[PDB]
Design a protein around this ligand. Structure first.
Ligand code: WDI
Length: 133
């Protein structure tokens, strides 16, 4: 029951500062423009200890499956090959991605009826708000 309140199908309803976050990460112009238009569906499910997070959009469909605390390989939507570890910290899913000596953290939290995603690269934060689909 670890992630019960995350499970479901969620739709993006607002984004702030995502272009600047992508620039800080190193995403190129064309990818930033097309990715920034997307209104993804995020689908979260749990089966035993395995959590799956799928993102479906016009830009790209992504899927990760993982066990908390156990590092895995991830190919991001912008085509980075990263090493990821996801943990639960006081009810917040904390996702760290490491590649080329760099790091970024994505936090996913339940707040009221929303799922709030905060993406941080050094000093730059982006907030992406989802509602139930
Ligand atoms: O779970 C998530 C929910 C979001 O709203 C966005 C996050 C994300 C960050 C970065 C990228 C990029 F392509 F920029 F790396 C793609 C997606 C992933």
């Amino acid at each position: 029951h670890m992630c019960d309140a995350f499970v479901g199908t969620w739709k993006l309803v607002s984004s702030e500062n995502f272009d600047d976050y992508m620039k800080e990460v190193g995403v190129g112009f064309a990818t930033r423009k097309v990715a920034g238009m997307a209104k993804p569906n995020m689908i979260i499910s749990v089966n035993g200890d395995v959590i799956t997070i799928k993102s479906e959009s016009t830009f790209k469909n992504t899927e990760i499956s993982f066990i908390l605390g156990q590092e895995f390989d991830e190919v991001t939507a912008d085509d980075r090959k990263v090493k990821s570890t996801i943990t639960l910290d006081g009810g917040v899913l904390v996702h760290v991605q490491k590649w080329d000596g760099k790091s970024t953290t994505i936090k996913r939290k339940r707040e009221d009826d929303k799922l709030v995603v905060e993406c941080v690269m050094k000093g730059v934060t982006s907030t992406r708000v989802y509602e139930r689909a």
